[PDB]
Design a protein around this ligand. Structure first.
Ligand SMILES: CCCCCCCCCCCCCCCC(=O)O
Ligand SMILES: CCCCCCCCCCCCCCCC(=O)O
Ligand SMILES: CCCCCCCCCCCCCCCC(=O)O
Ligand SMILES: N[C@@H](CC(=O)O)C(=O)O
Ligand SMILES: N[C@@H](CC(=O)O)C(=O)O
Ligand SMILES: N[C@@H](CC(=O)O)C(=O)O
Lengths: 398, 402, 403
């Protein structure tokens, strides 16, 4: 086989092979035969997430405890908020440029505090065994700091055993990085199969008003990359073209998997092999995979308008900053799983005063939901790109 | 900030600030705003339990396998049974002294609804990873000992490759164990806020209900819990030559945590660090302390003795002029059966009631039992603190014998 | 105490003490008193499975990555398929020799109820290795343990020696745990005599006092087929490969007896792996082939199902197709692979081979005869499981000597 631009060869062919097959009613032919090969690829990547996230972040607390972590924390969080606040606003502009909703809608027919407290796991083993990335992040930092403190103990028996544990954890972290290299050998077949399904199932439904909303989303996602990331990398001195060259693997994976969390092992390997320290990326990237959802903010901003246009609400000629605010909250609230943005979109809809209980909102929401995997691909790719852009920026600041 | 007597400054202030706010109907205000801070403290301690308990016991199986473990096991178990058997008897006396139940258990209508061998067999885990991932302190204890013993045997093998790789594993386990202790030092900095907020809740909620006959039962419990410490612990430590006043000085942190948390199990990280930092060997404390967090419930045994009487007095049963040793026996059984979670003693009280012959099906027993349950957290605090103190006392005594 | 033939002293005594007690209506006396001591034994062995399987296979990827694992894999899989294909055919021959089903399956009324294949192959790759470990799940663990071990070997040859040190550290700790579990199975086998005694004591005093008449005919059919699987297949196949069959039994005694009395192929795994270790097989071979065999290679199940399909077909008077009973041969292989290392699943997986011959559990006379077999299932499971485990060791030994 040639280079690993065979992902592109599988992507273009898979889009064509898919899109054609689904038009001829063979949606279930692709699902029953091609999709399992795409699922295996996701299966392999999900596997690596839990070890790689924990193990790299424990070794991630090699760097200065007060600063770095403290500084990099505030830095990355401030970055994350501002990018998501910009992302929805850009989606609003796209939903005022394109006007997705002339026709009358088809046919008819969490305690917050108890979320913050849930960042602290009550069983680190239980958290590890149950996915649960955010609680793992917390424990891994707390452990990693403790180990560093133990290594400066006057007692050299504690210093030995603390260094021992840290190595064994590092060995495991380093092992998962060697595996993501290997799992990327299957990627072209996995990529091929994954867009093959989405095109041959939801792609043959991107017609009419649904094409208008998808056009509004994707051009907003393109303008997110160019107007925000490409600009923001340029101001920070980091070459935007060398950035995409290095981030190509994680972007394509994020686009195809639609799982920000599932793309994490290949995102962290990209950050490793672009010369960022485990001190920065072991913290920023998993956090970004749960908290920074830029393409979701844009997706929600342009979808709140879709429904409000499809019902004929004026969308408050003034107070659509309620969307902007709430879409940031929804972005953070959104999971790194490959569907949650459409589910979380419900929260920004009740913010604008149109609940899914009114059967005509539900009618238009069900119409958006039919092409969600199409919208998810580009949205997720931007979600991951936002994470890497933020990491690269903050890693240069430090 | 001053010293870590800011726990006391946070305890007194919290009990006052709570007590007042709850009297003025702001029980839900405290619950929505103050309680989460006390919950964070609990979250943080719960976090450390599983790793600290497993890892320290594996390293704790450094001591002599046949003895220590063997000898220490029998010693602590014999100790645990006797303290508990005393604790109930002391609670019976307190319930004959104070007479909690002159009035007829008023309203009626608000009712409530283990195979023993399939309990012993459950000490052996079928999946140690599963055990660790699922709480389950007891099966973990079992496995951690078996592993730690296997490691010691492995290090004395003629094959030095097996010796090197075993010694490696033991260190990494110790590294983790040691790391968790460093963390409990950190999480204790939050303790004052955590304490403040936790009594702020209980006082502002069930405290403003400790009135009348419920005050009489509370008095009887607490004076019993006081008399457990002085008559049993302070005496038993004194006879074993360990200084009782130097004992409390060291146990201050664990005792206060246990009281405020009400989780015997959740207080374990701070109890074990108190055992470490009073110079007991991991060989002893890594075994006796988590075991005592599940098997040794002294303050529960007392609570159950005095509450069996409250109910029997509220219904006017004679509480068998003679055979209330059935309580004494069954309360020990209930104590052992009780969990280190912060409610179970009230739940387990049901077992000693059916022993005396008054089930929760009779809706007048159920009426009295529901009244006790209304001030349970108030009773749970003192009860849990005494629960944990018994663990340390036992460890100190047994450690000194060995 | 004497030697570790105290297992036999406990087995013989337990079979007798049981068989007597269950005849005198004390089935529940044995269950409530003797069975917990047998259960403790099982409990203890189950405990070691997950750590020993994971850790030994990670260290097991010490051997050559492309070959060994690749070669041993194809070899053992090919071995497994051919032994299972022969096993059912042998059971067919036993079910034609003995004729289990002359009387009409009397009593009607005790009915039972009526996996997506691709969504099984994909499940071999775990989405959370910790979850996998914490949930039993031997097969996803096998996949991850290999991938991890191979990654470590690659990491130790890296030009960066910080990555080489930390990787060697991890490998050692894992080996430390692997080795620890082996020392433990040495100990848990001291309890085995009491465990064995109590376990057959139950089965004999409960299902043994029911092995009478037609059910004794079907039991006789099974056990003579299991014996001929040992003598005609294993004893022969070891002899062709040069490995001494009598020295093989001498060493495999501990794993065989355990497997027999436990009926859990998976639960016998620590004692099967320690037998393979102390007969001098490399962890590269046995740490891969034995846990795979305890999930894929069910030879005694294949035989059990072949002879049980015939039992129900004879009981209903179906001619069992004078020609196409290779449908059973094929499907019993698939049912063997499908069968779990749990101590009862072979009777449950027998339902699949019955629908392959066209006689479902919905028909109230099939469900009557199936429930009759089910009543003596543990008697059949003992010999079946022991042969299941024997097949794993035989293959491991043959494939190890090939490599
Ligand atoms: C919306 C609060 C913003 C504060 C950011 C701190 C991280 C909290 C956000 C986590 C939300 C994830 C949703 C829970 C999914 C699990 O379960
Ligand atoms: C009653 C037996 C006393 C002998 C001491 C052996 C310790 C085993 C007792 C376990 C009882 C704990 C109750 C179940 C807890 C869980 O659930
Ligand atoms: C049936 C396909 C044969 C190919 C062999 C590959 C091994 C996969 C077979 C797994 C079947 C075991 C049943 C799953 C038990 C659990 O759950
Ligand atoms: N697929 C997105 C979530 C979403 O669809 O909003 C992600 O994981 O980033
Ligand atoms: N919460 C107490 C048990 C009880 O309430 O009886 C403890 O764990 O010590
Ligand atoms: N108990 C058997 C399975 C079966 O009953 O077929 C085994 O694991 O080997």
């Amino acid at each position: 086989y040639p280079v690993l631009i065979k992902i592109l060869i599988g992507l273009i062919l898979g889009a064509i092979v898919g899109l054609i097959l689904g038009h001829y009613g063979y949606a279930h032919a692709v699902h029953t035969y091609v999709k399992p090969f795409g699922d295996l690829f996701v299966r392999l990547l999900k596997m690596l997430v839990m070890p790689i996230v924990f193990a790299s972040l424990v070794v991630g607390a090699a760097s200065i405890s007060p600063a770095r972590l403290g500084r990099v924390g505030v830095k990355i969080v401030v970055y994350y908020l501002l990018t998501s606040a910009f992302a929805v606003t850009l989606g609003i502009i796209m939903a005022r440029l394109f006007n997705p909703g002339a026709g009358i809608h088809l046919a008819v027919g969490p305690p917050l505090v108890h979320i913050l407290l849930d960042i602290v796991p009550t069983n680190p083993f239980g958290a590890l065994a149950n996915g649960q990335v955010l609680p793992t992040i917390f424990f891994a930092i707390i452990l990693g700091i403790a180990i560093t403190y133990l290594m400066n103990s006057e007692n050299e028996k504690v210093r030995k055993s603390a260094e021992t544990l840290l190595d064994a954890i590092n060995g495991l972290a380093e092992a998962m990085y060697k595996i993501v290299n290997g799992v990327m050998q299957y990627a072209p077949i996995g990529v091929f199969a994954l867009i093959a399904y989405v095109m041959a199932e939801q792609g043959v439904h991107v017609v009419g008003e649904l094409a208008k909303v998808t056009a509004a989303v994707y051009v907003g996602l393109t303008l997110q990359i160019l107007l925000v990331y490409f600009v923001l990398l340029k101001i920070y001195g980091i070459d935007p073209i060398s950035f995409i060259k290095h981030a190509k693997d994680a972007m394509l994976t994020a686009f195809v998997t639609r799982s920000s969390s599932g793309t994490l092992p290949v995102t962290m390997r990209v950050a490793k092999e672009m010369g960022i320290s485990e001190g920065i990326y072991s913290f920023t990237l998993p956090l970004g995979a749960t908290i920074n959802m830029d393409g979701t903010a844009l997706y929600q901003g342009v979808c709140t308008f879709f429904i409000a246009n499809a019902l004929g609400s004026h969308l408050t000629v003034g107070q659509q900053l309620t969307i902007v605010l709430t879409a940031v909250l929804a972005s953070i609230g959104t999971a790194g799983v490959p569907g949650a943005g459409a589910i979380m979109l419900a929260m920004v809809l009740h913010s604008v005063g149109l609940p899914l209980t009114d059967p005509n909102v539900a009618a238009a929401y069900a119409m958006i939901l039919g092409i969600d995997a199409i919208l998810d691909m580009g949205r997720t790719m931007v979600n991951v790109t936002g994470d890497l852009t933020g990491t690269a920026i903050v890693a240069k600041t430090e």
